[PDB]
């Protein structure tokens, strides 16, 4: 149905996302159990990691477009990522390595995320009708990799240890690299302009030097979240000022604050919702026992099923509003399950968490994808920078929000943790409901401004 390089790009993306989510699904538990972090330290450190992973995505589009070429940058990114996964596996011999290894992953993701999608775009003549379907399948590729990793990585870490989990992440990247190199011939006339000139070693050295500096800066920021906080606070207020001095952009500003709220909520899946499943949900569904950390896999699961349906099935600001109402309902459902539908021993049915994750995934399907197009349709490089800075800040804020559910290591009674989770989830749901309402009220004015 699709050009041949589509299938190469599909499987490279699948395996790269498997490596990434193999780490993401186990990271907070690894912090708590393996490094002895409290739940609060683990949550804010996960927030810092996610902020860097997300904010550095801006680098890879530039490196691929203007310095080395898309295809060269896919190769370099995959190599830096694989190195990061194996360094993470090595951190079990050398615990002092952990932050460097995570910084290496962040920088590696930063170099690689934007480039396969770019490549896929060049596999189709410019107004080909199959583009929409191909990109919907690209998203599904991402979520099949994430579904596999979030399902199996906690199980693998329980049975064989973290070194094996992380080395398998590395192996997934290696086979992504092998599939690319084996298929290089399919994309010989596909690329950005630098792909077709010989490689400039000056620019490659600049890219490697900048990568290493960034690996060290990331390691430091993740080790000292108290300076990540002020760096992003002052940087954010300043870039807010520099946005305000310099009327279709105000739509981007209010939509950026709404995207920030969305990312604060998305950030709860590997942290507070993860530990909620651990502490206050039954670890059995349809008669099968599971690792509760695998419950994170319900997000890609619901995307995999729902992205085709919703492709088959207002316009921009209303889609954002709908996504925000869906997310609000996910957290109000979490709160409700804890308030009224729990056991005498403090445990709730996992069908409630299946529903929480359905609501949250529908929110994802309405907001995240739809917003990039809105960004691409209302607007340049500066707004990309401000966007990435603020959404990284959103992930830091999300780690901080998650700390309100943090449980001390000596607590063992589910009836003590249940009300903490329900208070925080209920208040998140109520605030997000308010945010969704103001979004609705502005939907008409917003929809006028897009004209």
């Amino acid at each position: 149905q699709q050009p041949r390089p589509f299938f190469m790009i599909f499987f490279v993306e699948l395996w790269e996302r498997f490596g990434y989510y193999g780490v993401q699904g186990v990271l907070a538990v690894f912090f708590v159990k393996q490094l002895g972090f409290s739940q609060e330290q683990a949550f804010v450190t996960f927030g810092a990691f996610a902020a860097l992973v997300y904010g550095l995505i801006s680098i890879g589009g530039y490196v691929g477009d203007h310095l080395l070429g898309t295809k060269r940058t896919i190769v370099l990114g995959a190599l830096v990522l694989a190195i990061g996964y194996f360094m993470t596996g090595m951190s079990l011999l050398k615990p002092d390595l952990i932050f460097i290894a995570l910084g290496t992953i962040a920088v590696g993701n930063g170099l690689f995320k934007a480039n396969p999608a770019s490549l896929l775009s060049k596999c189709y003549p410019p107004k080909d009708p199959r583009l929409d379907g191909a990109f919907t399948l690209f998203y599904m590729s991402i979520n099949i990799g994430s579904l596999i990793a979030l399902s199996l990585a906690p199980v693998i870490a329980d049975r064989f240890g973290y070194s094996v989990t992380y080395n398998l992440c590395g192996a997934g990247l290696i086979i992504a690299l092998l599939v690319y190199i084996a298929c290089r011939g399919m994309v010989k006339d596909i690329g950005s302009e630098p792909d077709f000139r010989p490689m400039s070693f000056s620019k490659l050295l600049y890219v490697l030097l900048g990568s290493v500096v960034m690996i060290f800066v990331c390691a430091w920021l993740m080790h000292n979240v108290e300076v990540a906080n002020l760096v992003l606070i002052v940087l954010s207020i300043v870039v807010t000022i520099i946005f305000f001095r310099q009327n279709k952009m105000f739509v981007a500003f209010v939509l950026m604050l709404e995207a920030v709220v969305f990312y604060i909520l998305y950030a709860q899946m590997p942290t507070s919702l993860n530990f909620f499943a651990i502490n206050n949900v039954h670890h059995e569904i349809l008669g099968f026992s599971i690792n509760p950390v695998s419950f994170q896999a319900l997000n890609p699961f619901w995307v995999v099923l729902a992205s085709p349906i919703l492709a088959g099935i207002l316009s921009m600001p209303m889609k954002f509003t709908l996504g925000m109402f869906m997310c609000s309902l996910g957290f109000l459902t979490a709160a409700a399950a804890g308030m009224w539908f729990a056991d005498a021993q403090g445990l709730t049915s996992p069908w409630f968490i299946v529903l929480v994750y359905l609501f949250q995934s529908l929110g994802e399907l309405f907001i995240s994808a739809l917003g990039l197009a809105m960004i691409a349709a209302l607007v340049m490089g500066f707004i990309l920078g401000m966007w990435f800075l603020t959404q990284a800040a959103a992930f830091l804020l999300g780690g901080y929000v998650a700390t309100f559910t943090a449980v001390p290591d000596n607590i063992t009674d589910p009836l003590e943790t249940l009300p903490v989770y329900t208070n925080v989830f209920g208040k998140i749901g109520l605030v997000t409901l308010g945010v969704a309402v103001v979004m609705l009220l502005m939907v008409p004015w917003l929809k006028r401004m897009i004209a």
Partner: nanobody, 122 residues
């Protein structure tokens, strides 16, 4: 995934016993291990447990007599039972649940040992 209990047996009132729970496949380190007991004609009841990060929980009637502990190198959980009384006679089971919680009812635990008989004679 399967726990093996050992160390039960017959003892006189005021004596001591040590139960131990060892797991086969997965490492017990990620698990709260609870000890349950079922006396003749009654339901399994929570006795004592240790979570994955050294938090402890006890039934009222065994505080000051039973101690739960964990040998994290040998991957083993222990129940040290001192000042034993006839009314401690029961089948004892270890059970394992992922994480930091020790729920009071058997339905909170997925993995079960087979049980060791403990008898305390007057």
């Amino acid at each position: 995934v399967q726990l093996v209990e050992s160390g039960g047996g017959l003892v006189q009132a005021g004596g001591s016993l040590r139960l131990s729970c060892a797991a086969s496949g997965p490492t017990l380190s990620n698990y709260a291990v609870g000890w349950f007991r079922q006396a003749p004609g009654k339901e399994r009841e929570f006795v004592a447990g240790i979570n994955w990060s050294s938090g402890l929980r006890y039934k009222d009637v065994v505080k000051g007599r039973f101690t739960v502990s964990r040998d994290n190198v040998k991957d083993t959980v222990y129940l040290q039972m001192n000042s034993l009384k006839p009314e401690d006679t029961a089948v004892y089971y270890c059970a394992a649940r992922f994480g930091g919680m020790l729920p009071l009812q058997p339905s909170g635990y997925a993995n079960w040992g087979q049980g060791t008989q403990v008898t305390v004679s007057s």
